[PDB]
Amino acid sequence: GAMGTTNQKEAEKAVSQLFEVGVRFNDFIAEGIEPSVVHTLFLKLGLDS
Amino acid sequence: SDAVEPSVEKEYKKIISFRDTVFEGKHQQFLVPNNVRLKFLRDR
């Protein structure tokens, strides 16, 4: 939440947890979410491919 | 300097709805067990 983590980064961590279940851009696309969201946040979170 | 962008609400709506579905664990693409449940909830 907002307990030390900034709102933007809070959104990012929620994405990172999604990343652990294996969310890729195609999965986001299946949910109507833009592929750019997975890719860009992936870069920001420094996640390994 | 990317501490709270313009992106934040846009990110939240898409992320929150996605995460909330997984929070119920009925996510069409992702079935989540125990360890995943704790990872989502404790981290964010």
From Swiss-Prot, chain A:
Outcome of gene disruption: Cold sensitive. Decreases degradation of mRNA containing a DSR (determinant of selective removal) region. Abnormal meiRNA nuclear dot formation in zygote. meiRNA dot formation in haploid cells.
Location of the protein in the cell: Nucleus
SUBUNIT field: Interacts with mmi1, pla1 and rrp6.
Reported function: Promotes the exosome-mediated degradation of mRNAs containing a DSR (determinant of selective removal) signal sequence from mitotic cells.
Protein name: NURS complex subunit red1
Organism: Schizosaccharomyces pombe (strain 972 / ATCC 24843)
Interval of the full protein contained in this chain: 192 to 235 of 712
Swiss-Prot record, chain B:
Coiled coil: none
Domain of life: Eukaryota
Protein name (Swiss-Prot/TrEMBL): Uncharacterized protein C7D4.14c
Organism: Schizosaccharomyces pombe (strain 972 / ATCC 24843) (Fission yeast)
Lineage: Eukaryota, Fungi, Dikarya, Ascomycota, Taphrinomycotina
